[PDB]
Write a structure and sequence with these properties.
By secondary structure, the chain is α+β, with helices and mostly antiparallel strands. The chain has one domain. It contains 14 helices and twelve strands. β6 and β7 form a beta hairpin. The relative contact order is 0.18. The structure holds protoporphyrin IX containing FE. Protoporphyrin IX containing FE binds next to α9, α10 and α14. Belongs to the cytochrome P450 family. This is Cytochrome P450. GO terms for molecular function: heme binding; iron ion binding; monooxygenase activity; oxidoreductase activity, acting on paired donors, with incorporation or reduction of molecular oxygen.
Length: 363
């Protein structure tokens, strides 16, 4: 089908021309063969994009390589940004994800409370109630865009719930403040930090909900295993977060000359940590291109990163999705995917815009 044509085109073409950051590979879902080939023949790979903002950059495609970059913030700087294209000046709000340790470590401490375990324990029964209602309102035996009707709805609910937003003069004035800045974003320390949490927990949680549904459509063996024993939901949530890799990569910038995969990454070079490709390294992961809930070491995966920038919201994400999926199995014995998805046109955000689903029956 498509996956074969791309395998042909990828192994055929001259390896230096492989530009993994092409967003048209990620939307057509044809990017796996390119990454597989690099993983073998050119693990640390110099490529060039047609786009200026990007230009030439290193693709780090293997698990251990990626870790060596992620964990080493002395050499590999999260400044000035963490996406490939260099910063404009549309949005100058201070993101601590694109800040380096001393300054970075301080700002992070300001958000660790809001995602602390005793606060998660407060939120759980609320998230569950609220998820329960969103799901009780879905239509039965009628086709819906799962992304708009379920993933966005549930994702919006969680973020609202996290910050006790509306869903009174100061509570209301803060929401409005936040809504303002989030709109501008799409088109000042503590405010950025709060905007980062929202941005960093929106499309990632969204896409993992849409992801799960497709994964189970593609593996009816593993749907059965899940509905038979619901104790496997946290496993399934892990394996989806690997399988789907909502943030495909994160970039860094070398502060000195550095040797990785026997190649000299030069000072000031851009380095793309391809988590999407590292999550499928045969060398570290058994049966990497298999949706496998009961795979051993289900938790060992790159999708939340490693090192000082490791997703601060990882346990909230896993608790959100756990509750969501408890509540989904309770209500719907089938989530039949009736048409092919329509994927986001980005090599950063690996996600869905459309996912046609029918829910036949309830309870
Ligand atoms: C499935 C869900 C999620 C995935 C896959 C994900 C993935 C990531 C990744 C890959 C990073 C960068 C790691 C690195 O550079 O080494 C990151 C950072 C971050 N994520 Fe998430 N994330 C998820 C959910 C969330 C949630 C729910 C929140 C907040 C409620 C959140 C907030 C953040 C923040 C604030 C950062 C920056 C951390 C720092 O700079 O120290 N994420 N996330």
């Amino acid at each position: 089908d498509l996956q074969r044509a791309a395998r042909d085109a990828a192994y055929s073409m001259p390896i230096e021309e492989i530009n993994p950051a092409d967003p048209e590979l990620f939307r057509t879902d044809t990017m796996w063969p390119y990454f597989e080939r690099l993983r073998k023949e050119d693990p640390v790979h110099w490529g060039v994009s047609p786009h200026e903002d990007v230009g030439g950059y290193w693709s780090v495609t293997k698990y251990n390589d990626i870790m060596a970059v992620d964990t080493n913030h002395e050499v590999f700087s999260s400044e000035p940004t963490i996406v490939l294209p260099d910063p404009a000046d549309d949005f100058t709000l201070p993101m601590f994800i694109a800040m380096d340790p001393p300054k970075h470590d301080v700002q992070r401490k300001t958000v660790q409370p809001i995602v602390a375990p005793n606060h998660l324990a407060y939120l759980e029964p609320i998230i569950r109630e609220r998820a329960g209602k969103i799901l009780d309102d879905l239509p039965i035996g009628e086709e819906i865009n799962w992304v708009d009707k379920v993933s966005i709805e549930l994702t919006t609910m969680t973020l609202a719930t996290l910050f006790d937003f509306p869903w009174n003069l100061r509570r209301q004035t803060l929401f409005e403040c936040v809504d303002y800045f989030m709109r501008l974003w799409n088109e000042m320390e503590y405010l950025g930090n709060l905007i980062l949490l929202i941005v960093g927990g929106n499309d990632t949680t969204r896409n993992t909900i849409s992801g799960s549904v497709l994964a189970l459509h593609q593996n009816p063996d593993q749907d059965r295993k899940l509905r038979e024993n619901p104790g496997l939901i946290p496993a399934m949530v892990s394996e989806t977060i690997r399988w789907q890799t909502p943030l495909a990569y994160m970039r860094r910038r070398a502060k000195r000359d550095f040797e990785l995969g026997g190649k000299t990454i030069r000072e000031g070079d851009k380095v793309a940590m391809w988590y999407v490709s590292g999550n499928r390294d045969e060398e570290v992961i058994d049966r990497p291109n298999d949706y496998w809930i009961e795979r051993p070491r289900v938790r060992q995966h790159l999708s939340f990163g490693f090192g000082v920038h490791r997703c601060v919201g990882n346990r909230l994400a896993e608790l959100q999705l756990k509750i969501i999926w408890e509540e989904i199995l309770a209500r719907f014995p089938r989530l039949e995917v009736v048409g092919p998805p329509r994927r986001v046109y980005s090599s950063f955000v690996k996600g869905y815009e459309e996912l046609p689903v029918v829910i036949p029956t309830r309870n």
